[PDB]
């Protein structure tokens, strides 16, 4: 149930702002930048799953 | 919610944590279009 709430309030987040989902849905078969950005987002107030 | 404005930083911080390759998307009548190099 908290990964739900969690998962909606991100989906809530990028669909706010579509900037940020251009920079987070470009194709590379390394997206290591954007799992920093991933790392560097959300880390500090989301859960582990 | 969303936390205001380290939205950039993190915008940033991706542009700036990236031998470059690129892909061809389309091509036709001797024009192409390449996805990736950000250097060129």
Known sequence: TTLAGELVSVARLLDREAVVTRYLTVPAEDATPRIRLIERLVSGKVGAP | ?40
Not at chain 2, 16 to 22: D, K, R
Request: glycine share 10%; hydrophobic share 40%; no cysteine.
């Open chain 2, 1 to 40: 919610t969303i936390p205001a404005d380290d939205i950039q930083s993190a915008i940033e911080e991706y542009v700036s944590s990236f031998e470059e390759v690129g892909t061809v998307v389309d091509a036709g009548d001797g024009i192409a279009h390449v996805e990736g190099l950000p250097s060129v």
